[PDB]
Write a protein that binds this ligand. Structure first.
Ligand code: NA
Lengths: 433, 433
């Protein structure tokens, strides 16, 4: 009735009103408005775009479509990192302890979910005894005291976004700057964050396939965050190749422990710092990025970041001695190398497919009620740019299974070697203002 | 997925192939493809548009989506006319006998439908005893014998177009040159016509409301016709004001009778000849529009037009004495003049709203559950660009009801008077080749 007019407005490129947008969102949420109108409207948006102002109102409408987490009791400026997927991305594990060591409040809400590897709870619960068996008041007290904690995600956060994305996927309206940017910021504002850091991924193995688009989507999200009082910043990092060497769960925790001691991979280290700096700044604990970086690099060297991880673990029941002795983490039975069939420099490592290969070991959930094996995964022995002689291992598979032929195969199909090869820029672009 | 890829292809301005299009049409018709995909696709069509090849494939996809009538048993080239909706339009009542009298096979398929006045069949009810339904044999016999017959559109001709229209209407994708050009041509090609004449309206009333867009839609529909070998021509006629004086059913039959004697209103007469000329040329009963026109004007003055009308009425049970004696047509109870409040020239007769006013007397159907009163209607006393004194009748309301104050008010509010005015050119342009 009124939807059809809003669609036609949108066709002509007319900037919708706050109430018009809220009518669609709530009408679509409660089942008043059917999906053929929603999809029609989604495509209309795809072509004629939305203003910075329509974005901010759409974003906020989706927040209010379901529950809103109030973290007013938690003290300080709580900054929340969002990443746009990334194979082997260990930043979340490192960042929460690292940033809390500088008295920045980290109120993590995380899950398990489906993917190449497990969620942050899955990965953390490889630390013997660790749990999220705790209330909201327990959660609030721990963040106020030790500046870090993690609970499970709530059920009903932005059910508008859930249904919209699902429609967008099956109508090809996913790739839209206003819809993506709103969809993301909505989940993070509903989750109760004050400020937000974004890790928008780019490269051959990324959702925003080009840096042109990456920087635009990121810029769109900053301006949304600023237009609703949520100071936002953004990194454009590369994901043509997996981040670090560890692709797994126990493997990635081991790698997080290394980076917490200043002993991480070149790439994971750098990204952790860049992202960490943005957070530390967003909670008024430094003036500029370099000072934050210095402070963060100090707490790596201090072992204070590392002790903040142990505190955090023992606060939630995890055996903190496992941080000191990583070999206590669940071990894989078999340890199988994948040797180069060729000499040269490693030119290409198809991130997602290496991710898939690790999933095939048991490391992630292909379906709703699959079970993760925390021990299994892939440790990269070479990165894009390293030399390699025929027979030298590119990769070591970690399995509780003798037969890994399908996995070895997927590794070879997705690691190319050439005469020369230059590793892409990891950190492309930061967006502050 | 398939459909998603088809949608995305179109998003990027790629030409759909023939198989993709059939898959969609067959899929959406049978129920495989859901409504939200269909709506997202049409919205993609709307923006990126299609090519002549795609339009042709879409058209024919829609033709084959249901049953097809095969008039091959009727000898000669069976040309058919389609008008894009016009208030007071009686050209079909005139053309069918007028062109059949020149030995052009009119195998007309018409419907009742909703709107301002009733359809062609509704109008033909006014001659008592006339009926629409007789057999496909009785249809084929009568056209070979007398070159003229009218039956109902029945079953599912273009079931894809039935469903997709409703979708386009309720999703705001009705105004797309590809979609309507196909929608029109499909239903016509499906009805068994060899050649097609299109009366594409323009002006205040009618869906297309500019001479540029009207020609664009026509040139598209002609091209599709020539592409599929169904030789097609078009008339761009004006419809900012109603056609002739008579707006109704019994009233429009009377007006069509006058026109058949060459005693019609100027505009109706001119539109008839232009449309007729085209039909005669497409039927190979003249080499020249000039020649064709002349034959049609001879047959009007002869009586041969009017005798063919009588023949046609007798063939389908109609009391053909009503032609010779108009007062036999169902008369109206009341006959109210609407006096002008102002001296001047009549500048504006808002065609669609006058059609509504006539509807409010009982001459059309707002909803499917209404019944037409055939007696009622509106006789215009002035056309745009006529001098009118204060107190002179602009309009006469033929009613079967005493209180008609809303109808009077609507007439006043949709007929403006000014110092000077000229009506548009009736015949704007023609698409011959
Ligand atoms: Na890693």
């Amino acid at each position: 009735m009124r939807m059809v007019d809003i669609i036609i407005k949108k066709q002509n490129g007319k900037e919708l009103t706050t109430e018009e947008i809220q009518f669609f969102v709530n009408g679509y949420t409660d089942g008043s408005i059917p999906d053929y109108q929603a999809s029609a409207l989604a495509m209309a948006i795809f072509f004629r775009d939305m203003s910075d102002r329509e974005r901010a109102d759409l974003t906020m409408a989706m927040v209010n479509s379901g529950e809103t987490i109030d973290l007013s009791a938690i003290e300080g400026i709580k900054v929340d990192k969002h990443s746009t997927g990334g194979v082997g991305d260990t930043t979340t594990l490192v960042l929460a302890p690292l940033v809390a060591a500088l008295d920045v409040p980290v109120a993590k809400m995380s899950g398990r979910g489906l993917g190449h590897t497990g969620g942050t709870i899955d990965k953390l619960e490889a630390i013997d005894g660790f749990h999220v068996e705790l209330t909201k008041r327990e959660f609030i007290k721990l963040v106020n005291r030790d500046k870090v904690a993690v609970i499970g995600q709530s059920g009903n956060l932005t059910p508008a976004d859930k249904k919209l994305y699902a429609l967008r996927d099956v109508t090809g309206t996913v790739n839209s700057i206003p819809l993506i940017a709103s969809s993301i910021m909505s989940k993070k504002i509903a989750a109760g964050a004050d400020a937000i850091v974004l890790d928008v991924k780019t490269g051959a193995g990324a959702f925003m396939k080009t840096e042109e688009d990456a920087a635009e989507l990121a810029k769109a999200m900053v301006r949304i965050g600023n237009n609703v009082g949520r100071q936002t910043m953004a990194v454009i990092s590369d994901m043509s190749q997996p981040l670090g060497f560890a692709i797994g769960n126990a493997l990635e925790v081991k790698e997080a422990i290394d980076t917490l001691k200043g002993e991480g991979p070149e790439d994971l280290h750098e990204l952790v710092l860049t992202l960490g700096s943005q957070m530390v700044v967003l909670a008024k604990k430094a003036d500029t990025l370099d000072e934050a970086r210095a402070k963060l690099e100090e707490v790596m060297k201090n072992g204070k970041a590392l002790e903040k991880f142990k505190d955090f673990l023992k606060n939630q029941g995890g055996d903190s001695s496992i941080v000191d002795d990583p070999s206590k983490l669940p071990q894989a039975a078999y340890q199988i190398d994948v040797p180069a069939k060729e000499a040269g420099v490693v030119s290409e490592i198809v991130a997602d497919e290496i991710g898939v290969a690790a999933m095939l070991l048991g490391a992630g959930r292909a379906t709703k009620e699959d079970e993760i094996d925390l021990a299994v995964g892939i440790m990269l022995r070479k990165k894009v740019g390293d030399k390699v002689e025929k027979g030298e291992p590119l990769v070591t598979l970690y399995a509780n299974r003798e037969n890994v032929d399908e996995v070895i195969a997927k590794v070879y199909d997705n690691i190319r070697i050439a005469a020369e090869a230059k590793a892409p820029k990891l950190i492309h672009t930061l967006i502050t203002e």
